[PDB]
Design an enzyme around this catalytic site. Sequence first.
Site, PDB file in Angstrom:
ATOM      1  N   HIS A   1      -3.353 -22.195 -31.442  1.00  0.00           N
ATOM      2  CA  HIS A   1      -2.717 -23.140 -32.385  1.00  0.00           C
ATOM      3  C   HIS A   1      -3.724 -23.563 -33.467  1.00  0.00           C
ATOM      4  O   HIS A   1      -3.336 -23.907 -34.568  1.00  0.00           O
ATOM      5  CB  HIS A   1      -2.149 -24.394 -31.663  1.00  0.00           C
TER       6      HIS A   1
ATOM      7  N   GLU B   1      -2.358 -32.876 -42.658  1.00  0.00           N
ATOM      8  CA  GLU B   1      -1.345 -33.596 -41.864  1.00  0.00           C
ATOM      9  C   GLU B   1      -1.132 -34.940 -42.488  1.00  0.00           C
ATOM     10  O   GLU B   1      -0.013 -35.275 -42.886  1.00  0.00           O
ATOM     11  CB  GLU B   1      -1.887 -33.684 -40.425  1.00  0.00           C
TER      12      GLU B   1
ATOM     13  N   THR C   1      -1.529 -35.083 -33.226  1.00  0.00           N
ATOM     14  CA  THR C   1      -0.505 -34.493 -34.100  1.00  0.00           C
ATOM     15  C   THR C   1       0.040 -33.206 -33.477  1.00  0.00           C
ATOM     16  O   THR C   1       0.898 -32.564 -34.089  1.00  0.00           O
ATOM     17  CB  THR C   1      -1.085 -34.192 -35.476  1.00  0.00           C
ATOM     18  N   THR C   2      -0.427 -32.794 -32.293  1.00  0.00           N
ATOM     19  CA  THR C   2       0.142 -31.632 -31.606  1.00  0.00           C
ATOM     20  C   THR C   2       0.621 -32.059 -30.256  1.00  0.00           C
ATOM     21  O   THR C   2       0.137 -33.070 -29.725  1.00  0.00           O
ATOM     22  CB  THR C   2      -0.970 -30.556 -31.430  1.00  0.00           C
TER      23      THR C   2
ATOM     24  N   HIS D   1     -10.313 -32.683 -37.855  1.00  0.00           N
ATOM     25  CA  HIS D   1     -10.154 -33.729 -36.857  1.00  0.00           C
ATOM     26  C   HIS D   1     -11.282 -33.685 -35.895  1.00  0.00           C
ATOM     27  O   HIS D   1     -11.374 -32.745 -35.119  1.00  0.00           O
ATOM     28  CB  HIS D   1      -8.816 -33.557 -36.100  1.00  0.00           C
TER      29      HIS D   1
ATOM     30  N   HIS E   1      -6.525 -28.356 -39.248  1.00  0.00           N
ATOM     31  CA  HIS E   1      -5.173 -27.885 -39.527  1.00  0.00           C
ATOM     32  C   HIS E   1      -5.175 -27.459 -40.980  1.00  0.00           C
ATOM     33  O   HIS E   1      -5.796 -28.097 -41.806  1.00  0.00           O
ATOM     34  CB  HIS E   1      -4.151 -29.028 -39.376  1.00  0.00           C
TER      35      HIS E   1
ATOM     36  N   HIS F   1     -11.492 -29.796 -34.707  1.00  0.00           N
ATOM     37  CA  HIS F   1     -10.710 -28.643 -35.173  1.00  0.00           C
ATOM     38  C   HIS F   1     -10.152 -28.907 -36.531  1.00  0.00           C
ATOM     39  O   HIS F   1     -10.328 -29.986 -37.056  1.00  0.00           O
ATOM     40  CB  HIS F   1      -9.520 -28.403 -34.213  1.00  0.00           C
TER      41      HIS F   1
HETATM   42  C1  LIG Z   1      -7.074 -33.818 -28.714  1.00  0.00           C
HETATM   43  C2  LIG Z   1      -6.352 -33.207 -29.840  1.00  0.00           C
HETATM   44  C3  LIG Z   1      -5.871 -31.868 -29.736  1.00  0.00           C
HETATM   45  C4  LIG Z   1      -5.208 -31.295 -30.789  1.00  0.00           C
HETATM   46  N1  LIG Z   1      -5.011 -32.031 -31.997  1.00  0.00           N
HETATM   47  O1  LIG Z   1      -4.328 -31.493 -33.000  1.00  0.00           O
HETATM   48  C5  LIG Z   1      -5.485 -33.300 -32.102  1.00  0.00           C
HETATM   49  S1  LIG Z   1      -5.227 -34.190 -33.535  1.00  0.00           S
HETATM   50  C6  LIG Z   1      -6.159 -33.912 -30.986  1.00  0.00           C
HETATM   51 ZN   LIG Z   2      -5.561 -32.296 -34.954  1.00  0.00          ZN
END
Ligand SMILES: Cc1ccn(O)c(=S)c1
Ligand SMILES: [Zn+2]
EC number: 4.2.1.1
Length: 257
Positions: A61, A103, A195-196, A116, A93, A91
């Site tokens: 993802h 986002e 957000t996931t 993030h 997005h 990570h």
């Molecule tokens: C812990 C975690 C895992 C995935 N995402 O998108 C977020 S914002 C936080």
């Molecule tokens: Zn995230």
Amino acid sequence: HWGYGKHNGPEHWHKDFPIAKGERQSPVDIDTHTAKYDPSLKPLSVSYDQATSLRILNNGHAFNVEFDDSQDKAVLKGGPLDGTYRLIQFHFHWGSLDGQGSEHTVDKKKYAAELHLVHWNTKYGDFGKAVQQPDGLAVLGIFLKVGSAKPGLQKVVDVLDSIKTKGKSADFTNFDPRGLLPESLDYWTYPGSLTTPPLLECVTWIVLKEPISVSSEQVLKFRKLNFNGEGEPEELMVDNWRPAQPLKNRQIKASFK
Ligand SMILES: Cc1ccn(O)c(=S)c1
Ligand SMILES: [Zn+2]
């Protein structure tokens, strides 16, 4: 299972994760004119000098750069936070196109990507227990705009070839996440969610006002990643963002005038 396509995307998630329609969902639009300055907010303290990155994983993802969170080594505190939150991963997005990808939005403006940096509240002992708490996580959110390259992102970009598909991972030691930060730590803050999926409502969001600039070629390389596993038909990892959700009974505070 959940994804970002037509048949398993954000409009579907609520069926397996009902909290998708809850009272403190993320991301939101940040209406700069309505976000009130709060002079009681403290400066943000980002202490990443002792960060120990470990590994980079394509999880189907996004990709996560993981850190050793077994001791206080990279922590966030101050700002809106009570107590100490340990960095566990970061990570991003991002979009298929330079004009979308973030986002959170700012006066409806979409950035090309959003970083993030995930932290969990050390009063709860581990990440798993923190996510069962309304104050279990602190996520530092940074917008990326396309412009000049961000030198401190390049090591991440160069390793992507080695984790092209879902489930691949690579050693990623000695990465300094300080190189991903803008100059200013001015921020907006509000209570929300992952957000996931599982979309858990654990997060104090801290969203930096100043975006970082990344080059065209940097974000291009994010978009060559794949959502699929090795041996499966190629589905480019792009547009792995959730749109802005209703603000409901929340106020966004500003750390700055
Ligand atoms: C812990 C975690 C895992 C995935 N995402 O998108 C977020 S914002 C936080
Ligand atoms: Zn995230």
